[PDB]
């Protein structure tokens, strides 16, 4: 039924690379000293625009379109901040000690102090970026991890699931294929697979702490508000 399971390993990689969202810019406001509201306004506006491309990117993930409309809404609602964070961590990789929110908005941990409780999450985001840099995470591996987060974050909350798990196995096969082609031994292949997947737990943690501050903090658009409102089970 699903065309995603028939794709080869290379067909999976090139489809994920081609579907990558564009790197957006922040406002070119030269007022480099940020207040608490100006800091929050830039990030909120950037996130509000990144979501539209994320929804487009999600529909190009192999097998995602085969899910029902309710299943797609649920996965995006549960994982959207995780997906933003791993994107932020990925493009901040070549800038140690810095977070590259946009090419015209590169922040350090000192600038995160403008908002309370944010400098703790900056340090976690920086620590994830540094960890990816020490592992030499490749772009082909990044797009596999980001797809996994999309399909795995809400698959165990479907209750009132088998097709998702088959797609997840496919992406796993794709990750191993990338590590064998890069020359890693068999032992190094499963050790690197485990290390990358263990980082997804920390990303989940970062997303949860961030949500906890975001719905306590609440101008965000109605789309971003409905994504945040979905995590108000507390």
């Amino acid at each position: 039924n699903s065309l995603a399971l028939s794709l080869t390993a290379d067909q999976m990689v090139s489809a994920l690379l081609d579907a990558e969202p564009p790197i957006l810019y922040s406002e070119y406001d030269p007022t480099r000293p940020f207040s608490e509201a100006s800091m929050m306004g830039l990030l909120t506006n950037l996130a509000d625009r990144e979501l539209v491309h994320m929804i487009n990117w999600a529909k190009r993930v192999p097998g995602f379109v085969d899910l029902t409309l309710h299943d797609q809404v649920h996965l995006l609602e549960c994982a959207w901040l995780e997906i933003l964070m791993i994107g932020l961590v990925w493009r901040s990789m070549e800038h140690p000690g810095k977070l590259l929110f946009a090419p015209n908005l590169l922040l350090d941990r000192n600038q995160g102090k403008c908002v309370e409780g944010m400098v703790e999450i900056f340090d976690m985001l920086l620590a994830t970026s540094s960890r990816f840099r020490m592992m030499n995470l490749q772009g082909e591996e990044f797009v596999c991890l980001k797809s996994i987060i999309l399909l795995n974050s809400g698959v165990y909350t479907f209750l009132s699931k088998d097709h998702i798990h088959r797609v997840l196995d496919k992406i796993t096969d794709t990750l191993i294929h990338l590590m064998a082609k890069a020359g890693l031994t068999l032992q190094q292949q499963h050790q690197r697979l485990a290390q990358l997947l263990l980082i997804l737990s920390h990303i989940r943690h970062m997303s949860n702490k961030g949500m906890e501050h975001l719905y306590s903090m609440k101008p965000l658009s109605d789309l971003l508000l409905e994504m945040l409102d979905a995590h108000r089970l507390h």
Binding site: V52, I55, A58, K59, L69, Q72, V73, L76, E77, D222, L223, E226, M227
Partner: peptide, 10 residues
């Protein structure tokens, strides 16, 4: 009615 619905099909 959610904006996510209209975004996932338009």
């Amino acid at each position: 009615h959610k904006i996510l619905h209209r975004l996932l099909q338009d």
